[PDB]
Amino acid sequence: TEEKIEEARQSIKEAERSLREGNPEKALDAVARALSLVNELERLARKTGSTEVLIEAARLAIEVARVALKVGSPEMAQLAVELALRLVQELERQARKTGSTEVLIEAARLAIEVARVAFKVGSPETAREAARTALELVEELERQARKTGSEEVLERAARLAEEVARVAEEIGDPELARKAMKVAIRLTEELLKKSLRELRRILEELKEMLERLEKNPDKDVIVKVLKVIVKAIEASVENQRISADNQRALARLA
Amino acid sequence: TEEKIEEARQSIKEAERSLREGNPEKALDAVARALSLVNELERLARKTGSTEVLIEAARLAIEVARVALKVGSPEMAQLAVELALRLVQELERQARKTGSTEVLIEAARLAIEVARVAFKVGSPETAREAARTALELVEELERQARKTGSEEVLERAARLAEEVARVAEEIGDPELARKAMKVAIRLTEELLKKSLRELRRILEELKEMLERLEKNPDKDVIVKVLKVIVKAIEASVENQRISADNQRALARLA
Amino acid sequence: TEEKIEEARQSIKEAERSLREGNPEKALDAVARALSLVNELERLARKTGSTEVLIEAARLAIEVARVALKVGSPEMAQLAVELALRLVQELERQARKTGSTEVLIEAARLAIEVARVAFKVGSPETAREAARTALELVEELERQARKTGSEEVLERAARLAEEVARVAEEIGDPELARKAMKVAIRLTEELLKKSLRELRRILEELKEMLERLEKNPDKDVIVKVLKVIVKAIEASVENQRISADNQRALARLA
Known part of the structure; x- marks a missing residue:
């Protein structure tokens, strides 16, 4: 099912070691074996449905394109990047059908690596579609982070959208960069909302821990006052x- | 006087009852009564000079436009929207002759409702002028808030400026949308100036309440210090x- | 060498006073003497390498152009402004070779005045180059401030970049005005970086001056607690x- 994949791991390890010796066709062999094996993982993972295989198959296909550039075959790297997109977009299908946010985050990180690699490779059209699919995943993290309300997916999706925009600036698509930056602002604003809501809580804590304890000048009361004072400063700093x-x-x- | 208002309220009800019944000529008649009744309430209010009747006549004329749509009479709804602006502008005049900013605020809220209604109605030219008279009112709230110096009229005028912008986007008008957003940033900036100047005050309060009272560790001195520390925190939150x-x-x- | 400066200062003063008398040719002569004397102050300062003589000769040439406009010779003013650019750009070379930031700041102010003067003069080409050289000086204050980390050269350069944008708007170059405003935002953001970092210092101070002294409620401990609490509020206001x-x-x- 998925242990036959470790052939792709070993054939990539052999590709970089045969590069230093000076064998160009024996290094291209270990690269071509990986490309054909990774091709079969596209259909082997469709039977197993495992998200981890699609992730690791995509990470291998990206490193194959990185190797194929140093070897001198921009066509092996073009295909390797095109095959990474097919794998990332399949994670986008499995992450909507399984609803898991963890897969959405690692799939968004892959789409960013696919975009950066494809320009050093030489296929900008697939890279633009790599950034387009990256924003689609971040915009799905928007929908899920505003449903689960977690202040961690909002932070991570805001980090990813800013990387998508910085990639789109390296791309040459200011349209995608401005779309991704806007998406980043809509998230970080609702981070300011929930963070200011926490200041409204500690404020009224620094109003009831006082207006009742302003009459009692106790040593433990004053120290309790100093404990809520700094726990309010700790949050207004953030x-x-x-x-x-x-x-x-x-x-x-x- | 006061009864021709409740007469219009009943005829609007009859217009909506006769639509569920099916009578089109009698639903149009009840709408026709409402427009002619609201017209007389405009004439009567212009002679009594009451801001209340002008407001209750505008809120009727607006809902007459809402009903004149479902009846299928956008001409009756065009006139209804036009008559709402005639009433909103007559609130602009009595707000300058009575110097009341509260009439201005309630007139701007009406000028915004006229703009949102006139598109569902289908008279955008009167809607754009409703947004234009809505910015004329926000910019009068600028003048008087910079005269009385109240940090609350600036906040309402800024919230109105934003709501004028969101309407102007539903309008189409990106000029008014950007006018209303540049007017909003004008106000929200001068709110930060008058609010940071209040931090500079309480900072120097938390510096004279200490540099003298750092030597005296009294029970009343330390409690005085804890009272200014949080009154500063109450202000940095704002x-x-x-x-x-x-x-x-x-x-x-x- | 430097005593020929005071001769030019008297000749400039003779021009405006002969304008009140009514002598047009003797006012043009006093301007012509100044332009020739300042020219010699430029040739002498390029050999002595003194930055102060280049500054004083530039301030004279600027006021030569201001007087040359009142007299009525826009050609003497075009030369006086171009000669001011020759002096400022030579201070730009000496300030890069000596690394002094004090010269960079005053030379940026000189270039700003050269731009504002040249439009009253009538050479917008030289004025736009006066603003280009101003942003070059401001962006060289970026490079030196991000090396020494001084939170005050960042403040001065931010104010200069905002004045350059104000000039560029008086110029008619929103290209420069947007370049200068983006230069200002670069600086005031790194002022926020090094100000939030100083806030991360005092946070952990208000954590170690507490979580060990929460158990010890001494009169000297709690006063030291109040000292750091306000020294944090001192910084969070900034x-x-x-x-x-x-x-x-x-x-x-x-």
């Missing part, structure tokens, strides 16, 4: 950190 | 709320 | 100041 990332997200629209 | 509104006002330029 | 400058710097892109 909003000044989150608001700074908005001013950095807003500035990358320039 | 700047992190106003600066957050700036970042939302700036993000709507994208 | 971030809300700087972050407000980022929101004003970003709003100028509208």
